[PDB]
Amino acid sequence: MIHQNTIYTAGIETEEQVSQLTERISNMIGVHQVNINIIDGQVTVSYETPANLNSIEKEIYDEGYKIVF
Ligand SMILES: [Ca+2]
């Protein structure tokens, strides 16, 4: 039911970027815990339906970042 993933991003460089993406992901319905590590690009997320990995990842991409799959 609750899923946890570490998403390995690239491109996130500033505190403002981190803040914005954190808020956007966190505010998706079903997304509970979110942490973004600016040094290593790891985005850790705990989430449930209706949120899913794909929709979280889409937000990452929409903000201009990339993901290592
Ligand atoms: Ca750069």
Side-chain angles (χ1 to χ4, degrees):
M1 185 204 54
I2 302 286
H3 300 115
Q4 187 162 202
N5 282 73
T6 303
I7 306 168
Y8 294 82
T9 75
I12 305 169
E13 295 179 351
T14 72
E15 286 194 336
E16 176 171 350
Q17 288 172 328
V18 167
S19 297
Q20 173 60 355
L21 182 62
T22 300
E23 183 84 341
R24 290 275 298 174
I25 296 175
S26 290
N27 293 347
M28 294 173 68
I29 301 294
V31 176
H32 309 313
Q33 294 100 319
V34 177
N35 181 259
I36 305 187
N37 182 316
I38 198 172
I39 297 170
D40 64 24
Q42 291 176 26
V43 174
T44 56
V45 293
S46 298
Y47 61 91
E48 63 185 304
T49 299
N52 50 65
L53 184 61
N54 285 357
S55 63
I56 295 167
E57 295 183 328
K58 175 176 190 292
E59 180 60 34
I60 297 168
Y61 271 73
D62 287 349
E63 298 194 21
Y65 310 117
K66 305 293 174 61
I67 297 170
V68 184
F69 300 109

